[PDB]
Amino acid sequence: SKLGGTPLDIDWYTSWYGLGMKPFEAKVQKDLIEPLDPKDIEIKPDGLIYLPEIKYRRILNKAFGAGGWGLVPRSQTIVTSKLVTREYGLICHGQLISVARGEQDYFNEAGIPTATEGCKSNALMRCCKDLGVGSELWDPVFIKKFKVDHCTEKFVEHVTTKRKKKIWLRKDRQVEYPYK
Amino acid sequence: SKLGGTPLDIDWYTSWYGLGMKPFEAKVQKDLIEPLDPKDIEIKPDGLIYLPEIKYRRILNKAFGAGGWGLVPRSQTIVTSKLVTREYGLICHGQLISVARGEQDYFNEAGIPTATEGCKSNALMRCCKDLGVGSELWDPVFIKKFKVDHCTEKFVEHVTTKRKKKIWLRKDRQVEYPYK
Amino acid sequence: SKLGGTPLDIDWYTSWYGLGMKPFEAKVQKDLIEPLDPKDIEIKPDGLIYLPEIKYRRILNKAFGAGGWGLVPRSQTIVTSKLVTREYGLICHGQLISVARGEQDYFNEAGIPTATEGCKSNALMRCCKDLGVGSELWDPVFIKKFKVDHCTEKFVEHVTTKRKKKIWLRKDRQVEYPYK
Amino acid sequence: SKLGGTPLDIDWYTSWYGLGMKPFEAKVQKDLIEPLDPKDIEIKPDGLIYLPEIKYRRILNKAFGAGGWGLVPRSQTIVTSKLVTREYGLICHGQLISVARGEQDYFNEAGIPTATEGCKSNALMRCCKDLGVGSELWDPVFIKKFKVDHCTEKFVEHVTTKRKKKIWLRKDRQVEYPYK
Amino acid sequence: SKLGGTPLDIDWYTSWYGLGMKPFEAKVQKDLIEPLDPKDIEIKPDGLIYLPEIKYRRILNKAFGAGGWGLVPRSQTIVTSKLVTREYGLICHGQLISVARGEQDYFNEAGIPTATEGCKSNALMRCCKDLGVGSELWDPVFIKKFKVDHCTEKFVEHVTTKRKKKIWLRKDRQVEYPYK
Amino acid sequence: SKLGGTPLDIDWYTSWYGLGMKPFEAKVQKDLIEPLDPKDIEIKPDGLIYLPEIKYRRILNKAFGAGGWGLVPRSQTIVTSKLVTREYGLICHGQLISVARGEQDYFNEAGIPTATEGCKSNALMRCCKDLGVGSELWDPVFIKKFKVDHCTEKFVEHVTTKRKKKIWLRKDRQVEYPYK
């Protein structure tokens, strides 16, 4: 109760069946460790590289196939005063892999469900860390080299309050909202 | 209770049966990842591309067939003061795929049921994200290229209050209500 | 309770049996996706095309047969101060397909039951959206082309208060009540 | 209750099945004791060398394979006023290896879930100590030699409060936040 | 309750299965009694020689193999006002060897979990005393000879309070925190 | 309750299986009665000769082998106000030999677990008395002769309170804490 909020065949809500039971067969493993395409990697303005959730979903569809994987809630959705959090589990081929808790920051009381799926996506991607999907994203050497050959530091002009700020962006990507 | 509102064989309301149990057979998977037709993609005035719900329904009918798929409510309909939200699950071939929560903004107290189906549609489309339906819609590179070869920025005249505003539209699509 | 109103073998009221269990056989699917006849499509004066409920009923009778389909109430009839709403489910071949909520606007306290069947019809048609019945009705490209080759904008004279108004109508259809 | 906080097939939550039952076959053992790459070893500013969690995950994926290993919670997440702690167990090939408790320091009330996965990572790495993953990291002779041939002591200028401080860094690595 | 604190296939928590049932085969016994490397032996400042826990873990991995051994809790973690204690059991090849209680002194209320693994390590090493791992460490003749040919008594200057103190250290090892 | 304290396949906690059932085979018996090395025998300052517990453990490992013997608790740990006591049983080759109660004097409330293993060691050695391990230690003629050819009485100066005391020590062993 440290976080200030209130809830908004196999019982997958609480079951731990198949957790690290047996490894997948060869082509699955080959598709999981497939190197990321550097062209598809995005970077937040604050300077953290990431991968869109649709890329994670496409990788999962290419590896396990549609219907061969899914997400299950594991705990009630706790809505903090400034974020929405929930704990999710990833199931592939009737087998539990990992359970991780996601986050999504919301600034408007109306946009809380818009966050409740954002958090879900975050949970998904973080669970995918167990499978090694986008491992290069968390490699510090990969981050440094990708940050020096594909990302540039540009001094942008914030238009909402007419204040200057220096932010990170891709070489081929322009500046978007809320910035210039 | 953070959101301010009040409720308006297999027990699919709460069951998790088949969630990521087995993948679908080959032609189903081939139809799910079929590339989108660029002619059918629409764009909201605010600058977000999307796909009509009827296209999602047609894709589902082409993939699983009529009667082979459906939506089930998973939680009571919570009606916020400015939107209607509900949590829905997608079931195909007696198998649960995903459960996601939708939104629909309503501006009139009478048009609340008109929202309760809008939210349903939204839930459907968001659940379809697990199957990869319209994955290109969430690809930032696809969004940029489609936004530069098929969408144009036009300075329109709002007629309700006689104020100028610059909005996004398709090249072959005119301006509709509430705008010019 | 956001809406202001008060209630006016298989327990189909609450059961979810057969929801997306198995698809229908070939001729059923062929009849469901049969293209609409453009001659039968009507348009409301406000500019929204639709299909009479009798056409939906005829399509259902041609596809599943008489007695092979029906509607079941799913919730108590809530009567708002300006509309009547109820939630209905569609059952074909002992199988649940979809559950959707309909609307019917009423302007007279006596004509409330006249609305309670209108809403039912609306619910039916909206549920039929899952089967793909009248999918072309929700296709924006179909709406534009049908609105330019079969519908005309005419400046009509309202006779109740002697005021001018410009409304939409079919080329072969005259003006009806409450208009000229 | 000494720590000041409150909770935020095989029942792996409490089961001890397979704990030290049988050893793994030859190639697994060969991959577990594979020497660390000195280029991948990082060092905290305070002077403690460590290995990123993604490296541990990659080693586990190379040894047991994706889906052949996972983590299970063993106790409720206790959130101290300045850190988040939880007890985790490592399961490989349906066999329990070790159960260890992790830590993650948090300085913002919003960033508590950001800690709840950090602690998970820490738990993972500490459990990996049983398998011998990164054993050289805890070898004092390895620490001394790696600290003298690959790490340098540099006098950096803290920019938040304009105070001088001498910290540890890699030869090829620059200074990051919160420092210069 | 003399200590002032409060709790923070085979049921290995309480089972005594295999306790001294049969001896191990020849190569295991040969690896257990393998003489210690004098270069790897460390000495605390107070004058007590010891072996890092990673060395014990490496010896166990070389003898029984990864997954062939593990630790199980045997009693609830009792946290004294100045130390953390817990009782642990060592299991190798599905066989119980010994159960011993460890210690870890903690000086900060936050660093209690940092102690709960220290105690675990201590328990491990003390249990290893049954197998004869590091027997020479407890041999008084070995302690005297190693203390005279490899350890030196040096008069160091404590920097926290500027007080002199004479402490023990290795010939090739410098002085660390909290001392000079 | 005369002592003032409070508790801090085969159920070996209470079972008496194998107690004096059959003798061991020849080489075991030969190794058990092997004469002690006079160089390894130590003497307490008060004038009682003894053998370090590591020597007993080494003898047991040489006789029965690692994993062929162990200790089991037989009663709850009773902690007297000035000592820690517990009753332990020795099991070799799946056979119970003896059950004896040990002691360990403690002078600090924190060092109680440090005593709980000391007592265990004491119990072990006392149980070993049944096997004849270190029988010469309890032989009065052996004690007299070893006390006259290998031990000397020296007048030492206690440094804590600056008081004189005459204590026993080995010829080759110096004076340790708390004495000079």
UniProtKB/Swiss-Prot annotation, chains A, B, C, D, E, F:
Q: Which UniProt keywords apply?
A: DNA damage, DNA repair, DNA-binding, Mitochondrion, Mitochondrion nucleoid, Transit peptide
Instruction: Report which superkingdom the organism of origin falls in.
Output: Eukaryota
* Subcellular localization, as worded in the UniProt entry: Mitochondrion matrix, Mitochondrion nucleoid
What does the entry list under GO cellular component? mitochondrial chromosome; mitochondrial nucleoid; mitochondrion
Please provide, alphabetically and separated by semicolons, the GO molecular function terms listed in this UniProt record.
Answer: DNA binding; single-stranded DNA binding
Per the UniProt entry, what are the Gene Ontology biological process annotations, in alphabetical order?
Answer: DNA repair; interstrand cross-link repair; mitochondrial genome maintenance; recombinational repair
Q: Which family does it belong to?
A: Belongs to the MGM101 family.
Relate the protein's function as given in its record: Performs an essential function in the repair of oxidatively damaged mtDNA that is required for the maintenance of the mitochondrial genome. Binds to DNA.
The protein in question is named: Mitochondrial genome maintenance protein MGM101
Species whose genome carries this gene: Saccharomyces cerevisiae (strain ATCC 204508 / S288c) (Baker's yeast)
